[model samples]
Target chain A: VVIGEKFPEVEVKTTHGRIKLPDYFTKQGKWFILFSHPADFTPVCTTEFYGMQKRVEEFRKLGVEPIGLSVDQVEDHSAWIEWIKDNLSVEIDFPVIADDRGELAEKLGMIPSGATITARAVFVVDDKGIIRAIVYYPAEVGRDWDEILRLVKALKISTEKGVALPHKWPNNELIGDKVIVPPASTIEEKKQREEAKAKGEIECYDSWFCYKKL
Target chain B: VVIGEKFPEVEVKTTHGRIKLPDYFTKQGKWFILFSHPADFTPVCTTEFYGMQKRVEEFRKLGVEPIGLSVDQVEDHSAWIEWIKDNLSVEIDFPVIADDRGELAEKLGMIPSGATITARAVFVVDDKGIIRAIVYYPAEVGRDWDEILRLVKALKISTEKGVALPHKWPNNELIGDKVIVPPASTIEEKKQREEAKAKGEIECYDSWFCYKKL
Candidate 1:
């Protein structure tokens, strides 16, 4: 449920079929996102679903799966997806979990302590089945699809390349497209950092804040 | 602690001075953001603090204040700000809570269970002392300042105008700058939604999903 930890194992029902989380997709080394909205058929949620549909293919290309949830019945979820395709001309190809009793939402701390409905929440799980990020927003403000995608990409790049992403990332104000080099923990590395910077291999605003474009 | 509820009140010490939560700013009807970075003097966190200082004025213009926190001692916090100002040419103007004991972070459920360090966490609280949004990221991926500003602006518009933001406000793939109309709740309202759409007051892919630019 929290970052740097294993996602809890659970059995859940979804519009696609019955599934076991953290295993159904993680078994294939596929990353997945489990997100929740306030409810079904609402305007913001509807527009959100439509926006998500437009990016399902892009998410798939990143080896990630997108799943949604609300405290509504499975019947409602199925009909809602159908309604979207029938009217909006976009097929919602993702499976939405049915938590009619808010059981899963409660377990993941997705809902408020005493509230039955859920908030705008997302959990990004890595290929190793560990949760890497958790993002939350209120019901009124919609989630940004691009920001979510940026997070997935940044985490992947940081993990694989052993570098950190700068703020705003590829479009960072200070160091555009440059990944951060991990700071030195030893005296020799500290000395080498300045040496490396002097040779123009990397740039830094400070000796400990080196960065370079990949 | 959650959206739709007042933030829990607490007293804490910051580099600026000791103050009470939710009341210190909310008393003046000013919104604020309480954010936590992992530690001081690290690369990604340093970039984040720099990026934040660049936008402190922008946040203020929106009637919001930004406060940062980490588990470092107050002395280290003060000296680090000095380091950045001397080295980066930008003064960090906001207060940073020196939570050497991680007490406030634990109270806010910021630090993961059984862990000593905190994740990159943010809580956006409105002027009424209600916690409106919470966003979380891992240490590797830096947060986008523009998106944070967007969240604050989107919430203000949603509260004041009584309309919902699209997926990415002001640049939505589907409806740029057009806010979504709240879906109909009553039978008569549903009929009126269709009538209004037909009259060009609102546009919707379906009767229940109307929108208008305002």
Candidate 2:
């Protein structure tokens, strides 16, 4: 439901940059990656931020810029950014939004509670600014950077191949031989699904074939 | 740095159950496994929580109580808990803290920017209130449940066996046959690690080796 949605335009101050939706979309003829963290200066978030900084090169190599957001004030974000430099000895060369009044989060549906602070969320927006994928995790649960990187790779592949990423679709991993007969309608899709099941490439109800080492 | 440290006492209301850090630890008499999600009712967080729900039996089997936290209020968390049940048809039978004022989060250094929210962080606290491990990820990324479960198992084994977990160690994996010799000061332990790595049964940085499989 989140995927294929368009991001609502919202303006907010940031630690390193200001984000304007119209300008951001205009700059990219490609998909853009937007990620939000809960707050700054915490151990888990700190590690996540540092890791992102380390892997920005990887995201850039894949033609994506990592933008960050949080529900904190801009001044707080700036202070944390400076703290990151002094304490972690790493440069956070990315934009991080400050959502003090929570308007941006409300528009993005990032804020769930008046008490509920914005948690972590990511949106993958295509050249048209249409969100193609979204992911969210709680404030306590750290994320998988490898998978994030992999998803970008996977989505890029999906865009190129017009194929949906299957379960555990690791980067450069084979995603099954292309479907021979693309489904036409609901009934046809069901029949084709059954055929794929019969051939053991697909299975019933969101199942994939067990990995078989060949 | 968070690992092998002490967890602070904090009181907060949660959706599924009431949570008090010190009391929770006292009740468990084992390690308290705590994690936080970005928000409630989102698709990705829904799946992550559902996966947790599905694995409750396993977590209980390991003598661990899994608690979740976020910045939402008690009312919102409760409402969303019900929503997950109705929508996903999966029962969520865990305590989710509603840290409305961000009291717990701030004390724990969870909140860096009041505007954004809390970052994703997980902590494993032992019976003695010593924090064992900590993991943090940004909002856009989801934590791997499999890895979390594995970590609990590994930590449990290490505590009981007086050993350590090796890189990428999984359940039923072989551990050290070679002994570890400690730092030159702790010669005995260092030799054990060297011998274990040499035997190709254990993997470590130095001075520690798991003595059992899995």
Best by TM-score: 1
The window of 10 residues in a row where model 2 chain B has the poorest summed lDDT is B172-181
> Which candidate number would show the highest lDDT if scored against the true structure?
1
| TM-score for candidate 2, residues paired by index | 0.48
TM-score of each: 0.94, 0.48
- lDDT by residue (tens digit), candidate 2, A1-214: 1334566666668765666773575466545677777666554466577677878888877777778888777777778778778765789887887777666665664543333466556666666676655555444444556667766776676566544433233321222322112223577666666665666664322222122211
Residue A192 C-alpha lDDT in model 2: 63
Task: Tell me how each candidate scores on DockQ against the true complex.
Answer: 0.69, 0.04
B156, model 1: CA deviation in Å?
A: 0.8
Overall local distance difference test of candidate 1: 0.86
Residue pairs that clash (backbone atoms under 3 angstroms), model 1: none
Question: Worst ten-residue run, lDDT, model 1 chain B?
Answer: B182-191
RMSD of each: 2.1, 12.8
lDDT of 1 by residue, B41-122 (tens): 8888888899999999999998999999998878888999999898878899899988869888877767875689888999
- Model 2's CAPRI class is incorrect
